[PDB]
Design a protein around this ligand. Structure first.
Ligand SMILES: [Zn+2]
Ligand SMILES: [Zn+2]
Length: 63
RNA sequence: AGGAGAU
Protein backbone atom coordinates (compact mmCIF):
# COMPACT_ATOMS: atom_id res chain seq x y z
CA UNK A 1 0.00 0.00 0.00
CA UNK A 2 1.24 3.48 -0.99
CA UNK A 3 -0.04 6.96 -1.82
CA UNK A 4 0.23 10.67 -0.90
CA UNK A 5 -1.44 13.07 1.52
CA UNK A 6 -5.13 13.83 0.96
CA UNK A 7 -8.27 14.76 2.93
CA UNK A 8 -12.06 14.69 2.67
CA UNK A 9 -12.41 17.18 -0.21
CA UNK A 10 -14.45 17.75 -3.40
CA UNK A 11 -13.93 18.67 -7.07
CA UNK A 12 -10.30 18.99 -8.26
CA UNK A 13 -7.72 17.21 -6.11
CA UNK A 14 -9.76 13.97 -6.05
CA UNK A 15 -11.33 11.52 -8.56
CA UNK A 16 -14.55 9.68 -9.46
CA UNK A 17 -15.89 8.45 -6.11
CA UNK A 18 -16.97 5.23 -7.85
CA UNK A 19 -14.08 4.03 -10.03
CA UNK A 20 -11.17 6.39 -9.39
CA UNK A 21 -10.96 8.16 -12.78
CA UNK A 22 -10.26 11.87 -13.24
CA UNK A 23 -11.90 12.65 -16.59
CA UNK A 24 -15.30 12.30 -14.83
CA UNK A 25 -17.11 11.88 -11.48
CA UNK A 26 -19.07 9.06 -9.81
CA UNK A 27 -22.30 10.36 -11.43
CA UNK A 28 -20.77 10.28 -14.92
CA UNK A 29 -18.86 7.03 -14.42
CA UNK A 30 -19.24 4.36 -17.13
CA UNK A 31 -19.14 1.21 -15.00
CA UNK A 32 -21.67 -0.11 -12.43
CA UNK A 33 -21.87 1.27 -8.87
CA UNK A 34 -18.64 -0.01 -7.34
CA UNK A 35 -17.89 -0.24 -3.62
CA UNK A 36 -15.82 2.69 -2.44
CA UNK A 37 -12.51 1.57 -0.97
CA UNK A 38 -10.07 2.70 1.70
CA UNK A 39 -8.12 5.64 0.22
CA UNK A 40 -5.11 4.02 1.90
CA UNK A 41 -5.11 0.26 1.26
CA UNK A 42 -8.11 0.02 -1.13
CA UNK A 43 -9.79 -2.42 1.28
CA UNK A 44 -13.61 -2.12 1.06
CA UNK A 45 -13.56 -3.95 4.40
CA UNK A 46 -12.98 -0.58 6.10
CA UNK A 47 -12.26 3.06 5.23
CA UNK A 48 -9.08 5.14 5.51
CA UNK A 49 -11.00 6.52 8.45
CA UNK A 50 -10.11 3.21 10.12
CA UNK A 51 -7.24 1.89 7.99
CA UNK A 52 -5.21 -0.65 10.03
CA UNK A 53 -2.13 0.59 8.18
CA UNK A 54 -2.28 4.35 8.76
CA UNK A 55 -2.40 3.58 12.49
CA UNK A 56 1.39 3.16 12.15
CA UNK A 57 2.02 4.89 8.79
CA UNK A 58 0.42 8.31 9.40
CA UNK A 59 -1.81 8.35 12.53
CA UNK A 60 -1.36 12.16 12.76
CA UNK A 61 -2.37 14.21 15.84
CA UNK A 62 -4.99 16.59 14.39
CA UNK A 63 -8.37 16.34 12.61
C1' A B 1 -10.33 11.20 6.16
C1' G B 2 -15.92 8.90 3.63
C1' G B 3 -18.77 9.70 -0.50
C1' A B 4 -21.63 13.05 -4.87
C1' G B 5 -17.71 17.55 -6.84
C1' A B 6 -15.40 22.52 -1.44
C1' U B 7 -14.75 20.68 1.78
ZN1 LIG C 1 -15.62 6.50 -12.45
ZN1 LIG D 1 -7.15 0.78 4.58
Amino acid sequence: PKGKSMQKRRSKGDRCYNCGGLDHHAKECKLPPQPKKCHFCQSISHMVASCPLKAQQGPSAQG
